[PDB]
Amino acid sequence: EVQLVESGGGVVQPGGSLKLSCAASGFTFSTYDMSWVRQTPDKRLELVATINSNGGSTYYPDSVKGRFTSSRDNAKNILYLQMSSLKSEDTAMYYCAREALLRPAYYALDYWGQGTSVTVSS
Amino acid sequence: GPVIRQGPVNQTVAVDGTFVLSCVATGSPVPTILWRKDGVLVSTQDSRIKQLENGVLQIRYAKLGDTGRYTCIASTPSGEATWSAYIEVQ
Amino acid sequence: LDIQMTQSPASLSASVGETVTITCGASENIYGALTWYQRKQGKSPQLLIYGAINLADDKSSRFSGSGSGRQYSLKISSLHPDDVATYYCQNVLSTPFTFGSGTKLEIK
Structure with missing residues (x-):
């Protein structure tokens, strides 16, 4: 049984900050790259963060670059996404996903958490 | 006798991005493709670097040191073909 | 510069089978x-196809991914009531790794 479990979502004011967690268990977290993906109310989806096995490489699209920091803790098995300067267009369901191990080795996410809700404004 | 229809192209990529080089090759038998970067055979072993299908080389989490001359080699028992391009990471 | 993914149709309702x-x-x-x-x-979403043509492990063969170049397709054979969902394609060639907007599949 593989488990991904996001926490720390909620409502925040424009410009605010937030720190999300993802508790993982039932697999070797230290072997895998992880992704943060989100889902706007319009039902569009958008990859917002990728992080590698040991945490030594990170990638962020232009839409969130500088405002979003991703990091992991491989001792206690958790994945974090720190968000600061949050804008209304960041209102989204955020998922914690695992990068599959494949041949040929294309980018795909085989396991997703059930997400944590994030809302921005008033 | 192998001939490269479309070789790799000149690109500017962002640091930490994923980019590819592609090399579309015809011939008979089907030409195997290799990749050299700055005259040396690219190590798919380093796990950023991936030889994918349809003759694509992919490089994830891009680094400044990935700037250079990437060369495609298309090979057949008959012969081989060459096509190169320059990648600048910033 | 960014790579577009467009999905056709936006939505559709069809019948079982x-x-x-x-x-x-x-x-x-x-x-x-x-x-x-x-x-x-x-x-949360679930992987269906990778590399355009390769089916995911614990997923029904009723799903088939095909295509090459610029054009791709997902076929769902013999529609089941549990296939009701949104389907999303994603460019995993080069960043940003954009998703198509997705396709709502409904039963009549």
């Missing part, structure tokens, strides 16, 4: 570096 095609277009040749995900209502 039918075959139904969903298409995905890229503004450029993405060499089959394309992945499909299924999202049922109130659920």
